């Protein structure tokens, strides 16, 4: 973890350790696959109203796991100590400098000195090792809340009238997607191991030079775009954090009287507006701070927040009323 040795020690894993490149490429590509699947797990929850009562606690613990997983991957990314590592560590620790009065004190405390240095990378490795185990404990708390109410289902109604045991049916159904998941992860690890990363992180970190080609990891791009859209330091970092916390608001702003979007024409449509808006945010994040892009990012940012705070409450109310007047004859 020494800042002099970290990059070379990873090259040593790549070159000298038997099957070392397999371990490293599994880890790096697996982190990406971990996010792909997490987004799908979350999107599933969004679509089927899984965040609703009585599964609010389940959802809230999920949001904590997501924050922890994002922090864990950032800590790991820094451990390579390539160019993207150094400046990622610099930019992200600096998020806290936006805190009124005691912000630069937090940052120098996080760094362990004047800038991102040896103290910084050694403590980020120690922390990267720790947080996966806290995530494991939070997953247990997640499964505990899952167990008392059980899973929901695609119809959004009670499952109590027809259950089948986990064993056999869903054990072997899980196996189908486990192998498909492994197949695809294998295609990347063996045939295309660097396609999801950044070439600049094969350059040792340099405290005097920030590459013009710096781009965040792909799974952080939508959030990056949101921050970049606000031309103010403090409000940029507040709005970006709020883009994660606003997930907590959905049990209250979903006014509907039925769980999930399966039988909801307007909600289905706007859900996919949300998804593709999120992809756009990420494509904006990958782009230069230039004319059409800056405005598109600011509008996509608005659409992102408006979904939770405005569209869902308005549309779910309208759908409530439409369901009623379409059947009642007085």
């Amino acid at each position: 973890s020494n800042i002099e040795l970290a990059f070379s020690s990873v090259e040593h894993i790549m070159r000298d350790v038997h099957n070392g490149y397999i371990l490293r490429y599994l880890h790096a590509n697996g982190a990406s696959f971990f996010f792909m699947v997490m987004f799908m797990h979350m999107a599933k929850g969004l679509y089927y109203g899984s965040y609703r009562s009585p599964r609010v606690t389940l959802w809230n613990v999920g949001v904590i796991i997501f924050t922890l997983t994002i922090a864990t991957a950032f800590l790991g990314y820094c451990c390579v100590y390539g160019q993207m590592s150094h400046w990622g560590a610099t930019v992200i620790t600096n998020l806290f400098s936006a805190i009124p009065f005691v912000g630069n004190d937090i940052v120098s405390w996080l760094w362990g000195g004047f800038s991102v240095s040896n103290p910084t990378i050694q403590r980020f490795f120690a922390l990267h090792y720790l947080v996966p185990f806290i995530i494991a404990a939070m997953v247990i708390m997640h499964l505990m809340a899952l167990h008392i109410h059980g899973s929901s289902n695609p119809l959004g109604i009670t499952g109590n009238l027809d259950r089948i045991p986990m064993h056999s049916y869903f054990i072997f159904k899980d196996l189908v997607t486990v192998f498909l998941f492994m197949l695809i992860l294998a295609l990347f690890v063996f045939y295309s191991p660097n396609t999801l990363g950044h070439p600049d992180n094969y350059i040792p970190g340099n405290p005097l030079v920030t590459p013009a080609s710096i781009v965040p990891e792909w799974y952080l791009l939508p959030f990056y775009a949101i921050l970049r859209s606000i031309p103010d330091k403090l409000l940029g970092v507040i709005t970006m954090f709020a883009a994660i916390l606003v997930l907590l608001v959905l049990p209250f702003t979903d006014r509907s009287v039925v769980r999930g979007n399966t039988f909801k024409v307007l909600s289905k449509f706007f859900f996919f507006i949300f998804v593709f808006n999120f992809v756009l945010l990420g494509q904006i994040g990958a782009c230069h701070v230039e004319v059409p892009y800056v405005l598109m990012g600011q509008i996509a940012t608005f659409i992102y927040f408006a979904y939770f705070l405005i569209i869902v409450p308005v549309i779910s109310t309208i759908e409530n009323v439409l369901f009623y007047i379409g059947r009642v004859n007085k």
């Binding site: 930019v91 400098s97 005097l208 920030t210 031309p231 330091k233 701070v289």
Partner: protein, 123 residues
């Protein structure tokens, strides 16, 4: 405490040197740049400073090359204002290194320094 030999720097060139782990920007400015710097109205600056508030000798721009947004190192001779561009979130600095556009709230900081003939001593 770093010593930099100013006699070694050519006319319109940037030099980057390390001091306390941070990059220190030094430009030998051209006469035209010096005028460009001291002919800008404060109303156009979110962090209002004259070029003279920021340099002791108009020929030598000496500043910490740390972007005041989130700490990236701005790229020299780039941007829309004839100075430095920060690739991280698109902050533009002018030829005095003041913030002209983007999320950075402040001008590039000036460290303490004195001259000793042909060499400046930063620290």
């Amino acid at each position: 405490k770093v010593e930099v030999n100013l006699a070694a720097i050519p006319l319109g060139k940037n030099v980057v040197v390390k001091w306390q782990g941070k990059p220190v920007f030094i430009r030998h400015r051209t006469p035209h740049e010096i005028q460009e710097a001291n002919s800008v109205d404060m109303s156009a600056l979110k962090d209002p400073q004259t070029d003279a508030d920021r340099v002791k000798d108009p020929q030598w721009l000496i500043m910490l090359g740390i972007c005041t947004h989130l700490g990236c190192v701005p790229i020299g001779e780039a941007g829309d204002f004839g100075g430095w561009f920060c690739p991280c979130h698109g902050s533009h600095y002018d030829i005095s290194g003041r913030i002209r556009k983007g999320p950075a709230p402040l001008n590039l900081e000036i460290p303490a320094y004195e001259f000793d003939g042909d060499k400046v001593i930063v620290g």
